[PDB]
Symmetry: D2
């Protein structure tokens, strides 16, 4: 079965640690990003997410939110826990990074879209 619980690392170099996901399929962890869109000083931020358990799947669909402690932005990732053809766990995730604009008119450019493959760290 693919499991979210553990230390992971991604193609960018950010590390993330998810804990035991309870019955409700919920979990928490911490995210130490390696890069930032803000020239602010990076700090390990909290992560609180959730995984799907409808048909107690082996390679479950999930999604979590990162509360950025060093910026006013938020980031959400959705992905799936896969067991790659080489027998190892990989998380293919896609994210949306929302920035904080002032007047509602600037909103058209407050969202970035990207990829991230997390491997067991």
């Amino acid at each position: 079965k693919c499991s979210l619980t553990g230390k992971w690392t991604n193609d960018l170099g950010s590390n993330m640690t998810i804990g035991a996901v309870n019955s409700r399929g919920e979990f928490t962890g911490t995210y130490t990003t390696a890069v930032t869109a803000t020239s602010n000083e990076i700090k390990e931020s909290p992560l609180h997410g959730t995984e799907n358990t409808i048909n107690k799947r082996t390679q479950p669909t999930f999604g979590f939110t990162v509360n950025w402690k060093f910026s006013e932005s938020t980031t959400v990732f959705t992905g799936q826990c896969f067991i790659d053809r080489n027998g190892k766990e990989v998380l293919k995730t896609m994210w949306l990074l929302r920035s904080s604009v002032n007047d509602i008119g600037d909103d058209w450019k407050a969202t970035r879209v990207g990829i991230n493959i997390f491997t067991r760290l």
Copy 2:
């Protein structure tokens, strides 16, 4: 201040209820979608999000994860609390829909993307 706690509705016609966002920026709510990508029967589903709290922002940034109870998918929403010119709170978001593929070789078409404007229900 733009508050997330409350009953909301959106353009597609979905309704969602957020409660008290705790000190840590966390909140839980329910999501009753009025539309589904799957032929399955729609069911109200849990919401676990979080609002950024960096400079005690009046128009805060947030992100939540919807754990579908009627599908093997997960949806992540990111956006921001704006207080529309006319005087109202309007929620501008962009979401990412993750479907469960059977093989990692199909991962490429499992993620959808869109917009959603929420308003106080």
Copy 3:
């Protein structure tokens, strides 16, 4: 039938003019954006796109590219030409705005994602 040929205007205020789409389903036009992510001075830029004609559809799928003359970025829109329940033509488009980064390491944040509903201007 929904037709791309004509003057259009969007929710942001940018105007665009598409010309006669030839046999190959190809067309060209000009795009005068109303807003920009760059504080550079806006200039009407060219547009060169293409529409799908496989089953000579009435509400065709399309996509075009905007060569920004006042910035080093590019923007692509994909959408569909619809005939809204009120009898009028609307183009629901979704776009990706690519920015020009220097070192390949900055690429993770060079892409914005958004919406735009074009109505007959």
Copy 4:
């Protein structure tokens, strides 16, 4: 200088051929996808893109539209010409897949999103 003219291949395994990008930044090519979202039989399809030419950039920005001949869809790719540290030209893109819905009330799930790293074939 990073050149777009040439034979390319990508992670999914698709091949694409761009020719001479004219003075105006325009180019036409063919796309032979190795993967499809539709059960239909794959067919090589036309490509009509354009590379931004603002400061005669060595690592230019571009965007193209693939007109699928085996489906009623359109795909738009945006990215940038990088010249990898090791000394090679690498194409970093993000695409947006537009499917044709029968009713505008279904428009919400017609757009997909992803990544694609191209390399000289």
